[PDB]
Enzyme design. Structure first.
Site, short mmCIF file in Angstrom:
data_model
loop_
_atom_site.label_atom_id
_atom_site.label_comp_id
_atom_site.label_asym_id
_atom_site.label_seq_id
_atom_site.Cartn_x
_atom_site.Cartn_y
_atom_site.Cartn_z
N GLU A 70 10.50 -3.04 -2.26
CA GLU A 70 10.78 -4.40 -1.78
C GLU A 70 11.73 -5.14 -2.73
O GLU A 70 11.41 -5.34 -3.91
CB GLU A 70 9.48 -5.18 -1.61
CG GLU A 70 8.76 -4.96 -0.27
CD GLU A 70 7.37 -5.57 -0.25
OE1 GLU A 70 7.10 -6.45 -1.08
OE2 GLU A 70 6.54 -5.16 0.59
N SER A 128 2.65 -10.82 4.43
CA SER A 128 2.50 -9.37 4.42
C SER A 128 1.46 -8.92 3.39
O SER A 128 1.07 -9.67 2.48
CB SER A 128 3.84 -8.67 4.18
OG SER A 128 4.22 -8.76 2.82
N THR A 166 0.83 -1.24 0.00
CA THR A 166 0.00 0.00 0.00
C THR A 166 0.85 1.26 0.00
O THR A 166 1.91 1.32 0.62
CB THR A 166 -0.95 0.01 1.19
OG1 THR A 166 -1.88 -1.07 1.06
CG2 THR A 166 -1.73 1.35 1.28
N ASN A 209 8.21 -11.70 -0.25
CA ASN A 209 6.79 -11.96 -0.44
C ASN A 209 6.37 -13.42 -0.34
O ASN A 209 5.20 -13.74 -0.55
CB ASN A 209 6.33 -11.33 -1.75
CG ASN A 209 6.25 -9.83 -1.66
OD1 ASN A 209 5.43 -9.30 -0.91
ND2 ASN A 209 7.10 -9.13 -2.40
N1 ORN Z 1 4.69 -7.21 0.61
C1 ORN Z 1 3.41 -6.67 0.17
C2 ORN Z 1 2.83 -5.78 1.23
C3 ORN Z 1 1.73 -4.87 0.76
C4 ORN Z 1 1.01 -4.10 1.88
N2 ORN Z 1 -0.17 -3.38 1.33
C5 ORN Z 1 1.99 -3.18 2.64
O1 ORN Z 1 2.28 -2.04 2.26
O2 ORN Z 1 2.54 -3.56 3.67
#
Ligand code: ORN
Ligand code: ORN
EC number: 2.3.1.35
Lengths: 193, 205, 205, 193
Positions: B81, B205, B1, B200
Site C-alpha cells: 500500500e 479498510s 492481512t 488508510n
Molecule cells: N489497509 C489495511 C487493510 C488490511 C486488511 N487486513 C486487508 O488486507 O485488506
C-alpha cells in the site's frame, strides 16, 4: 534445470484445480471468492497462523481442521475478514465449509466440512453476506480447473487493497512442482505459528 | 492481512510439509514488515496431492518451499500500500541472530526512518536513534551504517561523504553492523509515504 | 527530542527533588507517545533556588511537579508535528498496571489506528488488531471499546451504530476495557497525518 | 487557591534568571540558544534522561554533573543535537560548560564547569558551530533577567520543529512556585530514567 517462475501459481503442480468468481461480497463486483481443490491421490497438509491473540473465526476454524493434517479444499473470500464476529461469525465459517463440502460431494467427490480450510480477508467487524457467499460457493466448484487461468482467478479473487496478484511456481528438475499464491498490502507484519 | 496458499505434487506426509512450511515462514513471512501491524487473519497453507509420486529429500522440499515463499515476499513488498521505496534492512555483527532480527525490525518499523526514506534522505541519525531502543546488546561506539553500499556512519560517528549519498532509486538497502558478534538478519520493509496515509485514511479498510 | 527544565523557589534537598521528578516523568512524560520514536537527547531537569525559604511536605512537592509536567505534556501533544487529533488512549480492566500501559502504547503506536483517526474513521477493528499483539493476558471475548463515550465494540464484537460514530472533532478519547483484572493506564498520542509525513520527508530534521 | 498558569515559565519562581538569543546556530536566524540561571541561596537539582543506548554528549555530560545534586545553570541550544559526534563532540559540550562557567564568573558569580548542565536538540550527526555558540554564551549571560520575558525568550530559543513554545507555572498557596518550559514535536516518546 530447476526453475522458479512467476505468472504461475497454485494449479502449476499436478492434482489441483482452482477458480475465482465475483460473488457480490465486494460492492465493486470484482472477484472475491477463490477455491483451491486437491484432486488427490494424497491430501497431506500443514498450516501456520497469526499469533495475534485476536483471531478471526476463519483462523479458529482452520486451526482445528489442520490438527488432522488433512485437506481437500481451501475456500477464501475477500471483501470481509469475518473477524470480531463472535459465535455467529464462527457459525458462518462452519456453514461456508459445509456448503463447500456439499457442493463438492454433489459435483462428484465425497467431502466433509472437516476437510475444508476457510480463509477470509477485508474489514474487521462486519458480518459476511451469506446468501451471496453461498451462491458463490456453488458457482466456484463448477468453474474450478487445473489450467493456469484457474490459478490466476483464484489469485485475483483473494485481493483486497493489492493492485496486482501474487503468484510463483518452482519447477524442480526431478519433476515435482511447488506452486503458490499470496495477497496483502497493508496490515502486513506476519508473526506465524 | 497476508493470505497464502502453497500447493505441491511432491509426495510428502504432513510432518514433511510442516517442517518445510515452518522453516519457510520463519525466514520469509516472519521477516516481512510493511507497516508493523500484524493481522487477525494471517494464514499460510501447504497442500500435497502427491500426484508426481516422487518423494523428494527433505532438504530439497524445504528449499523449494522457501524459494517460493521468498519470491512471494518480494512481490508482496513490491505492491505494498502506497509504496515508493522497496527497503531491505540488514543488521550484521549482532550478539545473536535474534538480536539482529530485533534490531532490524526496530529500524524497519520506525516512523522517522520510513519518512526519511520516503523523502530519499540518507538520515543515518534516525537509524541510530531507532536501533538504540532495541532491547539488545549494543555498543554505540562500534555501530556502522550503510545505504546502498555507502558507509555514511562508522564507529558510531559520521563518515566523510555521508549527506551526499543518492537514494532517489526505488530500491534501498540499509545495512547496520553492530560489531559485537556474528549474528545477522534481514527485514523487507517499505517507506511511509503520502499514498500510504491516503489509502488508510480516505476510506475504510 | 523532548527537553524540559523545571525551576522552583521552594526549598528541597536533591533527594526530595528526585522523588518529585521521577514520579512525575513516569506518570506523564513516559506516557506521552507521539510517533513511537524515542530520541538520543531527552532530558528533564528540576532546579531549586529555595529563595522562598519554605520547605513543603513531600506530597506537595510531588503533586506540584506532577501537575506542571502533565500540563506541559498536554501542550506538547497539542503542538506535535502535523497533529490534527489530540488522542488519549486509556486501557482499563487489565491484569496488572503494566499490562494496561503496554496495551495502551500498542494501540497508540499503531499505523492503522493513527491513520484511521486522521481520517475521522471509527475503524475499531484496527484497535482490536493492535491490542491483540500486546504481550499481555488477553481474552478476545471480553474486550470493549468506546470512542468519545460512544461504545463501538462490545465483548469482542461490533456494537450497533459503531460505524456511525462522529470523530470529526480534534479531541478523541479511546477507552479499552479488557475485563481481565483492574490495571489501568493512559497514553497521550496524536494522529498520522499528511502534514506529519510532509514535515518528516520534505527536509532533514 | 493553587493556580496553574500558562504563558508563565522558568522565571516565574524566585531565584532564577533566563534569556534566549539568536547566536546563529540556526540558519533562519531564529532564537536558538537559551540559558537558565539559579541565583541561590540553594543549588539543589535532579535529572532524568533518555534510556536510549545512543546517548548524545550533552546527555552523558549532564548525567555526570547531576551525580553531585548541584546546579548553578543549564545551557541549551537548538539547531544541533551534538549526538553521535565522538570524543570531539563530548569536548564541545565540555567547552560549552566551561565558557558558561567563565561568562558567569565575569558577570559576578564564581562558577566552574561542573556546575553547568548542557542540553542540545536538532539534527543528529553534525558538529556544533562552536565560534557562534561560544559568542552566544557571552551574549546570553549578559542578557539574562528575573522577569517573565526571560522565561519566554528561553522557551522560544529551545524550539526545533515546534510552532509554539510550551510554558507553565504553578503558584502554590503556601507562597512558592514551580515553573516549566519544554520543547518537542517529533521524535517524541520519552523513556526516562
Ligand atoms: N489497509 C489495511 C487493510 C488490511 C486488511 N487486513 C486487508 O488486507 O485488506
Ligand atoms: N522531525 C523530528 C526531529 C526530532 C529532533 N530530535 C528534534 O527535536 O527536532
Amino acid at each position: 534445470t530447476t526453475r522458479l517462475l512467476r505468472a504461475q501459481g497454485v494449479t502449476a503442480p499436478a492434482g489441483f484445480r482452482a477458480a475465482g468468481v465475483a460473488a457480490g461480497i465486494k460492492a465493486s463486483g470484482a472477484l472475491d471468492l477463490a477455491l483451491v481443490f486437491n484432486e488427490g491421490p494424497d491430501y497431506a497438509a500443514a498450516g501456520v497462523f497469526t499469533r495475534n491473540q485476536v483471531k478471526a473465526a476463519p483462523v479458529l476454524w482452520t486451526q482445528q481442521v489442520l490438527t488432522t493434517g488433512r485437506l481437500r479444499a481451501v475456500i477464501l473470500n475477500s471483501g470481509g475478514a469475518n473477524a470480531c464476529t463472535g459465535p455467529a461469525g464462527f457459525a458462518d465459517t462452519h456453514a461456508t465449509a459445509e456448503a463447500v463440502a456439499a457442493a463438492l460431494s454433489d459435483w462428484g467427490t465425497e467431502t466433509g466440512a472437516i476437510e475444508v480450510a476457510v480463509c477470509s480477508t477485508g474489514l474487521i467487524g462486519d458480518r459476511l453476506p451469506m446468501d451471496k457467499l453461498l451462491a458463490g460457493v456453488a458457482h466456484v466448484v463448477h468453474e474450478m480447473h487445473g489450467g493456469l487461468v484457474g490459478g490466476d482467478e483464484a489469485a485475483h479473487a483473494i485481493m483486497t487493497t493489492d493492485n496486482v496478484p501474487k503468484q510463483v511456481a518452482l519447477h524442480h528438475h526431478d519433476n515435482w512442482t511447488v506452486g503458490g499464491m499470496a495477497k496483502g498490502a497493508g496490515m502486513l507484519a506476519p508473526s506465524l505459528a | 492481512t497476508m493470505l497464502c496458499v502453497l500447493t505441491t505434487d511432491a509426495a510428502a506426509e504432513p510432518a514433511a510439509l510442516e517442517r518445510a512450511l515452518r522453516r519457510a515462514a520463519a525466514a520469509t513471512f516472519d521477516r516481512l514488515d510493511i507497516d508493523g501491524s500484524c493481522s487477525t487473519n494471517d494464514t499460510v497453507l501447504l497442500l500435497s496431492s502427491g500426484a508426481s509420486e516422487i518423494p523428494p529429500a527433505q532438504a530439497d522440499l524445504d528449499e523449494a518451499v522457501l524459494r517460493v515463499c521468498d519470491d512471494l515476499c518480494a512481490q508482496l513488498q513490491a505492491d505494498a500500500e502506497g509504496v515508493t521505496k522497496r527497503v531491505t534492512v540488514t543488521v550484521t555483527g549482532a550478539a545473536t541472530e535474534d538480536d539482529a532480527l530485533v534490531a532490524a525490525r526496530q529500524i524497519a518499523r520506525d516512523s522517522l526512518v520510513k519518512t526519511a526514506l520516503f523523502g530519499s534522505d540518507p538520515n543515518w541519525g534516525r537509524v541510530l536513534a531507532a536501533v538504540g531502543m532495541a532491547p539488545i546488546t549494543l555498543d554505540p561506539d562500534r555501530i556502522s551504517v550503510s545505504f546502498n553500499g555507502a558507509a555514511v556512519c562508522v564507529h558510531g560517528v559520521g563518515a566523510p561523504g555521508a549527506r551526499e549519498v543518492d537514494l532517489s532509486d526505488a530500491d534501498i538497502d540499509i545495512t547496520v553492523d553492530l560489531g559485537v558478534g556474528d549474528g545477522q538478519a534481514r527485514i523487507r520493509t517499505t517507506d511511509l509515504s503520502h499514498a500510504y496515509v491516503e489509502e488508510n485514511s480516505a476510506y475504510s479498510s
